[PDB]
Amino acid sequence: EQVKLKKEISLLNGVCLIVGNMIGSGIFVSPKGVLIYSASFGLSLVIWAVGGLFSVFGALCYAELGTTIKKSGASYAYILEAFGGFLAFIRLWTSLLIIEPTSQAIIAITFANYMVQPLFPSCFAPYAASRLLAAACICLLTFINCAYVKWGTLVQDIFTYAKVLALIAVIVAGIVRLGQGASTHFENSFEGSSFAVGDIALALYSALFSYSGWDTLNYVTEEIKNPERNLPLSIGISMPIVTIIYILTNVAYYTVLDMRDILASDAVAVTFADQIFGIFNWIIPLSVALSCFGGLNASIVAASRLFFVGSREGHLPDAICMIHVERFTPVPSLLFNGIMALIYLCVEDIFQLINYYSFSYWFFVGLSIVGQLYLRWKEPDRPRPLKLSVFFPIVFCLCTIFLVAVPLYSDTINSLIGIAIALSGLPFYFLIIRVPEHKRPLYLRRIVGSATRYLQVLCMSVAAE
Ligand SMILES: CC(C)C[C@H](N)C(=O)O
Numbered sequence: 497e498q499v500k501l502k503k504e505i506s507l508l509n510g511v512c513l514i515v516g517n518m519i520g521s522g523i524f525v526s527p528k529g530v531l532i533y534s535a536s537f538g539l540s541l542v543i544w545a546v547g548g549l550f551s552v553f554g555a556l557c558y559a560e561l562g563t564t565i566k567k568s569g570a571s572y573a574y575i576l577e578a579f580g581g582f583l584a585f586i587r588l589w590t591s592l593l594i595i596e597p598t599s600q601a602i603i604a605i606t607f608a609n610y611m612v613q614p615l616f617p618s619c620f621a622p623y624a625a626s627r628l629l630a631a632a633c634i635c636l637l638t639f640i641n642c643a644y645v646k647w648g649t650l651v652q653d654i655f656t657y658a659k660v661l662a663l664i665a666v667i668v669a670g671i672v673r674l675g676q677g678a679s680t681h682f683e684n685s686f687e688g689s690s691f692a693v694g695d696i697a698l699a700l701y702s703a704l705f706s707y708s709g710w711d712t713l714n715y716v717t718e719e720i721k722n723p724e725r726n727l728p729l730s731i732g733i734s735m736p737i738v739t740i741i742y743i744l745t746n747v748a749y750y751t752v753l754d755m756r757d758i759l760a761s762d763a764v765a766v767t768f769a770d771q772i773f774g775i776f777n778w779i780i781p782l783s784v785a786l787s788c789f790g791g792l793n794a795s796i797v798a799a800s801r802l803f804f805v806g807s808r809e810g811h812l813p814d815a816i817c818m819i820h821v822e823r824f825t826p827v828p829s830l831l832f833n834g835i836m837a838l839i840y841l842c843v844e845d846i847f848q849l850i851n852y853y854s855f856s857y858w859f860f861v862g863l864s865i866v867g868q869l870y871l872r873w874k875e876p877d878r879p880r881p882l883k884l885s886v887f888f889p890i891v892f893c894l895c896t897i898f899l900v901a902v903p904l905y906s907d908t909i910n911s912l913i914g915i916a917i918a919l920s921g922l923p924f925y926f927l928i929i930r931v932p933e934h935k936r937p938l939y940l941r942r943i944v945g946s947a948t949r950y951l952q953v954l955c956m957s958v959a960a961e
């Protein structure tokens with residue numbers, strides 16, 4: 497045949513990618529970010545609905561963008577199309593240095609924690625055991641995605657089914673508790689509600705942070721069986737599912753747990769399970785583990801394809817595209833991503849890094865949408881299969897301006913450190929990537945070419961063609 501990443505993604509695989517990467521484990525463990533800043537059950541539910549609506553706006557923007565540009569790499573390929581080079585290398589680098597390795601490593605550590613949780617419910621799980629299970633999970637998922645692409649989509653589908661079945665168990669338990677008559681929590685809700693622009697803005701911020709997995713399928717979009725039809729349809733099938741699941745899962749939590757017994761909880765779903773299931777309360781930490789497995793597989797697929805496209809341009813070394821000659825899977829990109837994710841596992845406290853890259857993440861999303869608006873102004877008659885109204889790009893541009901202005905006045909020093917990360921990768925751009933390949937150092941090209949030729953047959957990868 498021809499060495500090239502085949503399509504090998506259906507509509508169901510796309511819905512499962514988006515849903516498994518958007519749900520994750522922040523609805524089982526910490527769904528109390530909206531409830532802290534909105535002191536009511538009713539107001540927190542309304543803010544969940546409003547955040548879901550604004551995330552639907554952003555996801556419609558990204559469906560339009562993905563059918564317009566049609567290149568893998570969610571915001572990298574959309575900053576590279578409207579803007580170029582600069583601001584696309586920075587985002588790619590940001591994702592390479594901090595965003596993707598931290599995200600993955602944290603998902604792996606959470607998987608390990610909630611795998612060993614049923615036998616460590618009160619005490620702390622060991623640090624070495626958590627890190628070794630996280631490393632084993634990252635290695636297994638990187639290998640499964642290095643073997644075949646259909647294996648990666650299959651694992652994603654299985655563990656997304658597991659996610660939604662656990663969340664449907666939670667939702668059904670909550671709705672049954674409501675139906676027996678013991679509501680007593682929505683009896684007089686909207687009572688302690690805090691109505692202040694600060695606390696409502698922070699609740700909206702937490703809600704919009706909860707839905708952060710709709711650009712997933714925009715990373716693997718050269719690998720969809722019919723992108724012009726399976727990107728918008730997959731996104732518009734996955735947004736209602738995740739929104740309704742979030743709202744109904746919070747309804748279940750609020751039905752069973754009172755506020756006290758829900759803000760002092762280290763893992764809400766777990767408490768919910770301990771309080772309603774009795775024994776078989778271990779189903780929920782196991783389900784958080786399976787949820788993190790699915791989310792980590794989605795993260796690995798997305799990051800591997802982002803680095804594939806990064807090196808397909810002049811940004812990363814052109815030994816990262818390098819599709820496998822007989823499996824048609826990006827082996828060097830997946831290996832590089834897994835190595836970078838296993839390096840961050842050695843960091844003891846790895847959530848300060850979340851605090852480092854929050855602002856940069858939402859800045860790059862907003863810059864992708866601004867690039868969409870620019871591509872609507874410049875080059876208007878460029879082929880657009882989905883030409884949505886200019887209302888969704890504008891509304892989510894404002895919403896991401898808000899999501900980026902919150903961390904720039906709340907924790908202004910961590911956002912500056914994230915900016916430092918990006919423009920600290922910048923010195924690789926003005927001396928290696930900006931210079932033509934023929935005048936850059938002869939010996940450095942020699943070394944890189946030899947290393948590439950020695951991880952070529954090793955990865956059994958001949959890149960494109
Ligand atoms: C999309 C993910 C990176 C975030 C996800 N909503 C969570 O469970 O925390």
Ligand code: NA
Nearest residue numbers: 708709710711
């Ligand atoms: Na996102």
